[PDB]
Amino acid sequence: MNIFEMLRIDEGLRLEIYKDTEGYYTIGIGHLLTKSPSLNAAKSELDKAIGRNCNGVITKDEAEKLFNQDVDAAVRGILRNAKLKPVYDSLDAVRRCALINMVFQMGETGVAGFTNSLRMLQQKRWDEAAVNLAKSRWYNQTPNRAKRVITTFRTGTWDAYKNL
Numbered sequence: 001m002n003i004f005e006m007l008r009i010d011e012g013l014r015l016e017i018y019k020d021t022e023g024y025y026t027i028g029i030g031h032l033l034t035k036s037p038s039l040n041a042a043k044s045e046l047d048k049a050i051g052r053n054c055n056g057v058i059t060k061d062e063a064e065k066l067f068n069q070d071v072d073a074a075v076r077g078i079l080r081n082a083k084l085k086p087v088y089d090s091l092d093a094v095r096r097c098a099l100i101n102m103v104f105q106m107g108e109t110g111v112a113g114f115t116n117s118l119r120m121l122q123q124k125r126w127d128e129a130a131v132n133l134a135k136s137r138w139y140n141q142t143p144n145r146a147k148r149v150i151t152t153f154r155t156g157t158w159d160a161y162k163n164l
Helices: 003-011 039-050 060-079 085-090 093-112 115-122 126-133 137-141 143-155
Strands: 014-019 025-028 031-034
Touching: 003 060, 003 093, 014 039, 025 039, 025 060, 031 039, 031 060, 039 060, 060 085, 060 093, 085 093, 085 115, 093 115, 093 143, 115 126, 126 143, 137 143
Parallel strands: none
Antiparallel strands: 014 025, 025 031
């Protein structure tokens, strides 16, 4: 299991514009297009992102290309962020994937806000961090995905995904 397979399980693959759990316009493997209510705004962002007139639909290849960019941007983002970098540096390989997953879903800014949880992971207080991470809007809104990530931080293994 690796970061790509993990995120592909959590996000799904859709080749037509869709609305994510929060109601925003998304395409492919969790590639957020716009928070705007307009399907037109969305379709415009889409063509800008692909470099073609897509009219709301893309190919498997295009979806994966966007996915490759997003994962790369997530990693570079963590590495450039004063709050996340040190946490990332401190973790083992599996737990690193867990933090990457959070940043792909909620952005650098959002994860950087989990101050107390970041501190606990850095200290390697596994169980305590899992309990703190569960006290969030994140967990309440997308509980099955949050549980999978949380279990990953808790155990340092891919058990939560070995099912899936």
